[PDB]
Amino acid sequence: VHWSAEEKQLITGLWGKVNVADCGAEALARLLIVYPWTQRFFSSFGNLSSPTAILGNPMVRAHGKKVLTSFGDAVKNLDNIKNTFAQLSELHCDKLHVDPENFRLLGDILIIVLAAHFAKEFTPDCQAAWQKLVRVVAHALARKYH
């Protein structure tokens, strides 16, 4: 729950170069493709019958942007994370009933998606900071049970 000064610069510096739209769409598309059961939650997005259909689906692409924007709010409120995700926690837990393990899977997809987008710039120390950020956001969403 405590951030070293080094971690903040590490996540912050990187966020500024993130293409929220492309990475957002790629991360969400990957969650629906490598972990198929997650598609059950997005029945309202229409066509999700093939990887291609999924990568081409505009709603998937659009929702992806919103999710990553949501991560940006965390990057700017590194210490106010609970409040920032309070209402999202209720949506996912009480209205959707998404099991917290899935938050962990999305966070990992996001890590590998950033690695492919930054390559060597995504150093081991950098990955470690982001892994932490992703676990905190996941924990802040898995609150309604706690």
């Binding site: 790629e26 598309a29 990957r30 493709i33 490598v34 990887p51 999924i54 990568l55 990992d108 890590i111 590998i112 998606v113 690695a115 492919a116 987008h117 390559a119 060597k120 995504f122 081991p124 120390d125 990955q127 470690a128 892994q131």
Partner: protein, 141 residues
């Protein structure tokens, strides 16, 4: 379960990394030791300093075992039966650690060969790593 499609995708990507087994193997272990410190408890005898010869040598062995599994992808349990006793019986590695390692692996290929790690290959590669993890913990699962 591994399909004809997955077998092909996995072999595809492994052709590209076969050349750098030591390099990728070392980076994989270092990222693992860095993002999941708890894993260091299994290597008290190792010099865990970045670049250490022990990590480079072991990282090499680890990727080789992976390659061996790709080539006998139809019976991964037989190709790795010796590693299975080591990890499950002797070492008693907590099953959760295999996912950490597998994840760090996907990360190093994403970094060095992004164009090759498409969504579908990612899925195939994820199934494969999960298969290997199942076999190496197989003894007590």
């Amino acid at each position: 379960v591994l399909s004809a499609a997955d077998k092909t995708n996995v072999k595809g990507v492994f052709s590209k990394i076969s050349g750098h087994a030591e390099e990728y193997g070392a980076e994989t272990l270092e990222r693992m030791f860095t993002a999941y410190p708890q894993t260091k408890t299994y290597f008290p005898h190792f010099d865990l300093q970045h670049g250490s010869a022990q990590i480079k040598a072991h990282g090499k062995k680890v990727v080789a075992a992976l390659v061996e599994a790709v080539n006998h992808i139809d019976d991964i349990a037989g190709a790795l039966s010796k590693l299975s006793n080591l990890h499950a019986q002797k070492l008693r590695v907590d099953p959760v650690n295999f996912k950490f390692l597998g994840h760090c692996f996907l990360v190093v290929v994403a970094i060095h060969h992004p164009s090759a790690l498409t969504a579908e290959v990612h899925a195939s590669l994820d199934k494969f790593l999960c298969a290997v993890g199942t076999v190496l913990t197989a003894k007590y699962r």
